[PDB]
Amino acid sequence: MASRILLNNGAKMPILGLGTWKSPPGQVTEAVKVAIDVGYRHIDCAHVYQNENEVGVAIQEKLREQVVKREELFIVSKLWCTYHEKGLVKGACQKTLSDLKLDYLDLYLIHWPTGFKPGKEFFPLDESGNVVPSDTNILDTWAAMEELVDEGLVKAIGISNFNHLQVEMILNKPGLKYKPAVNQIECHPYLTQEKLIQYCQSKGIVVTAYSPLGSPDRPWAKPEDPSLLEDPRIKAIAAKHNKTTAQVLIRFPMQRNLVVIPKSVTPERIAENFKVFDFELSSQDMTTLLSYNRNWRVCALLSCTSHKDYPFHEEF
């Protein structure tokens, strides 16, 4: 589709972006310098990726050589769960601004619908292994997000891993100032998200799909797990197209009006990943892909299954 989808806030947003979860501080700068070199204009970031400083370096570097202008960059960070208490949102936002070395974000997401106990510990757990919630509610958190818009710190606000009932709850929030611009969710061939994707676009909310390649590098990957990249059925469509299994996987959600944010620190792969503004997949394959759906989640936040705002109990 069109390279820069438009958000319900006036801004357009690059449908392909560089993902930075699991990109170690020591490698992430050179990856963001490279990805910008090849053409990426969109960076997916989070405080909880513990590399924002290093990311921010690469971004400043490119501006101060005027390889790209600020207003050309679509930069996304997220508010981690330990920061939902409304009084802490602003500070968390400023901190990530300071890390990235930016005056403003193009998009700040509520990273998960679930509030954690505030601290340094990103995932605070009781003795049984479930996280320690805060009794914060979404709407209060969301309202602090809105204040960030009005204050000029962020240009848009979205949500990530929200079920539809959770988006609905914000939409129907009395006194609502801004509807969420984006829902960032897990989306890929073994989790096609047809129902929630439908719901979100219809409400005029742009859907970014995360872990498009299945996130083989996810730390808790069992060896016996399915691998998108090494699925014979998916390898074929790629050979048929004279492109890589990954390039398929990346163009797939793009042909659904989703935004997509593959992660790499491998400069070769980073650029292999951007070589997708120049072909098309057939409706034959598109529907075949959608048929592989196993309702399989890479990110299920299982330590939070007994959190009142755990989002994955809902069908969608």
Ligand SMILES: NC(=O)c1ccc[n+]([C@@H]2O[C@H](COP(=O)([O-])OP(=O)(O)OC[C@H]3O[C@@H](n4cnc5c(N)ncnc54)[C@H](OP(=O)(O)O)[C@@H]3O)[C@@H](O)[C@H]2O)c1
């Ligand atoms: N909002 C949320 O809750 C949430 C959750 C998960 C992810 N996300 C976002 O989505 C981004 C992408 O998702 P992800 O990090 O889960 O995993 P992913 O993008 O599905 O896959 C990344 C893994 O695949 C490898 N890879 C990258 N390009 C490749 C290529 N062209 N060929 C073969 N292998 C390739 C990478 O290796 P190397 O890097 O070693 O090359 C890395 O190990 C994240 O980084 C994050 O920004 C958001």
Ligand SMILES: COc1c(Br)c(Br)c(Br)c(Br)c1Cn1c(=O)ccn(CC(=O)O)c1=O
């Ligand atoms: C639920 O909190 C934990 C816990 Br508990 C542990 Br242990 C780890 Br490791 C992570 Br990375 C997290 C946070 N987390 C996930 O669970 C799944 C994906 N991600 C990446 C993301 O949210 O973008 C997490 O940070």
